[PDB]
Amino acid sequence: ILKVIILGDSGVGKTSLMHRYVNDKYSCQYKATIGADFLTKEVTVDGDKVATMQVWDTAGQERFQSVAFYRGADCCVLVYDVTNASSFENIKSWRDEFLVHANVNSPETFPFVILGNKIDAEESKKIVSEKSAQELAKSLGDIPLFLTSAKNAINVDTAFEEIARSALQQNQ
Ligand SMILES: *CCC(=O)NCCCNc1nc(=O)c2ncn([C@@H]3O[C@H](COP(=O)(O)OP(=O)(O)NP(=O)(O)O)[C@@H](O)[C@H]3O)c2[nH]1
Numbered sequence: 669i670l671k672v673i674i675l676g677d678s679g680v681g682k683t684s685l686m687h688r689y690v691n692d693k694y695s696c697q698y699k700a701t702i703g704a705d706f707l708t709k710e711v712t713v714d715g716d717k718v719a720t721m722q723v724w725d726t727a728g729q730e731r732f733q734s735v736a737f738y739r740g741a742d743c744c745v746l747v748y749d750v751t752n753a754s755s756f757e758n759i760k761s762w763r764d765e766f767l768v769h770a771n772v773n774s775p776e777t778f779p780f781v782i783l784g785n786k787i788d789a790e791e792s793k794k795i796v797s798e799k800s801a802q803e804l805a806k807s808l809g810d811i812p813l814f815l816t817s818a819k820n821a822i823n824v825d826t827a828f829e830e831i832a833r834s835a836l837q838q839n840q
Pocket residue numbers: 676677678679680681682683684685695696697698699700701702726727728729785786787788789816817818819820
């Protein structure tokens with residue numbers, strides 16, 4: 669039933685976030701994602717309505733990418749790394765890439781969620797203000813925002829409850 673797509677630059681932590689939420693596990697070892705594929709999780713909404721969530725991981729590197737999979741999606745998650753300025757500045761282009769290729773019926777209502785990942789990292793290395801993120805998140809149509817750590821299992825549960833809630837609303 670529920671199709672969710674996760675987009676964002678290489679290295680931001682998409683695959684890690686998916687393993688955290690679906691499998692409650694994490695691994696330090698970078699293994700580059702190639703082509704799109706999904707894992708599944710049975711969910712229960714805040715309402716105690718039940719659903720199977722199909723979570724799609726995608727490649728961040730141009731050369732490992734795929735097009736069709738974007739269609740169907742009931743929610744789109746946009747992920748940047750709080751330690752990498754460029755990843756953040758690319759969020760709107762990931763959003764627009766999705767809308768161009770996704771063939772969704774109402775772009776101004778279609779649910780996106782943004783995640784800022786790697787908050788567990790040392791302050792010295794962190795670059796993207798919460799404030800900036802909240803600005804970008806509003807300017808893109810008041811999209812929900814969540815700061816997360818796949819590594820330390822921080823807030824990934826919260827983030828994905830909204831992603832679930834927003835996706836079920838869009839499906840039917
Ligand atoms: C354990 C060694 C250590 O201390 N490393 C530094 C800790 C940095 N913290 C941290 N926090 C996170 O929440 C987190 N998520 C993911 N990473 C790391 O970044 C690399 C990329 O992970 P992927 O999940 O492979 O990223 P991606 O899917 O977007 N890449 P693709 O688009 O597929 O190329 C990886 O090293 C992961 O461990 C985090 N690090």
